[PDB]
Amino acid sequence: SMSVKKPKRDDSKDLALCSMILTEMETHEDAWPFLLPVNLKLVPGYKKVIKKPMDFSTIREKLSSGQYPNLETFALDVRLVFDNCETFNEDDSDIGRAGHNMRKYFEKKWTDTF
Numbered sequence: 001s002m003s004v005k006k007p008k009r010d011d012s013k014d015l016a017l018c019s020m021i022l023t024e025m026e027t028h029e030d031a032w033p034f035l036l037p038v039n040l041k042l043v044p045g046y047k048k049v050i051k052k053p054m055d056f057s058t059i060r061e062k063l064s065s066g067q068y069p070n071l072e073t074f075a076l077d078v079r080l081v082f083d084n085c086e087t088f089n090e091d092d093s094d095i096g097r098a099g100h101n102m103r104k105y106f107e108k109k110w111t112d113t114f
């Protein structure tokens with residue numbers, strides 16, 4: 001509360017570390033369904049169903065232009081990519097399995113890093 005603060009966690013490296021995690025996700029071999037925005041003109045249903053589209057390139061742009069206030073808002077967008085994936089894809093499909101794999105991969109990196 002006012003004039004009563006927890007000891008200050010060092011956040012100076014957060015930007016750099018999130019960029020690193022994002023790079024490892026971009027270079028993962030199962031990253032391909034998530035590298036670019038879903039084409040809303042060529043994928044019937046997606047625009048109406050998925051209220052907040054998100055992909056790694058959009059995250060990269062937001063990260064690089066100072067649009068994440070903190071590392072929690074970064075993690076939310078990453079998770080949004082995989083939540084979107086589950087909403088639109090069968091678990092038993094290549095894309096559906098890609099999403100499950102990448103989420104696991106992300107969350108481990110996330111815990112190990114912070």
Ligand SMILES: O=C(O)c1cccc2c1OCCO2
Nearest residue numbers: 071072073075076110111114
């Ligand atoms: O999951 C999060 O949003 C988050 C935010 C700050 C620090 C963390 C976090 O996740 C676990 C590791 O340490």
Ligand SMILES: O=C(O)c1cccc2c1OCCO2
Nearest residue numbers: 086088089090091092093096
């Ligand atoms: O992909 C799935 O496992 C799944 C999960 C919940 C509801 C469903 C599902 O697939 C077919 C439609 O209804």
